[PDB]
Design a protein around this nucleic acid. Structure first.
Lengths: 92, 92
DNA sequence: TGCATATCAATTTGTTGCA
DNA sequence: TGCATATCAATTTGTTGCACC
């Protein structure tokens, strides 16, 4: 399933337009990204949360030259699936 | 941020109602979960993808009885943030 | 796209049960 | 959500760069 297909399915459950539902899902996706980047945790009860996570510098290795090197510290977006989501993927 | 706060923020950006936007956002979240469960990979352009992943059985330990135990094989929801999301979180 | 080094290396998650 | 076990043990991603695996 892609964005479009999702938009289609959604328009139906809530009852709006393709243009509409698209506009709204987008608003949410861009807002999620913004919040996480700006250091906020996005929480969505049952579905899961999004957060940015710090990553320390770590040593890696050049597969070409075989030299040791340092992978600099970074920040990554992270997701944690909420309970309802986990339990639909793996029914207890 | 929470669903509600996301709802409030979303209603504005795309131009809808709070009861409306919510119902929409909800639709999408249920559908994502439903899709991922049935083995459907959800790929949203300019955000990331959701999929279900196999996990083999693995070793654990009962913190009560301190007995070694086997955690059964399962499936878990996984999120794969796209390039845009990653670059916003961590400018290149 | 996928896949590859390193006898990697920093990281995530789960295990019970109750608060 | 948290705590509290293992001198845990699977998991993930990335290092640079080809067209394999």
């Amino acid at each position: 399933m892609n964005k479009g297909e999702l938009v289609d399915a959604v328009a139906e459950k809530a009852s709006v337009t393709k243009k509409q539902a698209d506009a709204v899902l987008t608003a949410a996706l861009e807002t999620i990204i913004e919040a996480v980047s700006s250091g906020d945790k996005v929480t969505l009860v049952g579905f899961g949360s999004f957060e940015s996570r710090e990553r320390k510098a770590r040593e890696g290795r050049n597969p070409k030259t075989n030299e040791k090197m340092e992978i600099p510290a970074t920040r990554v977006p992270a997701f944690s699936a909420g309970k309802l989501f986990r339990e639909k993927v793996a029914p207890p």
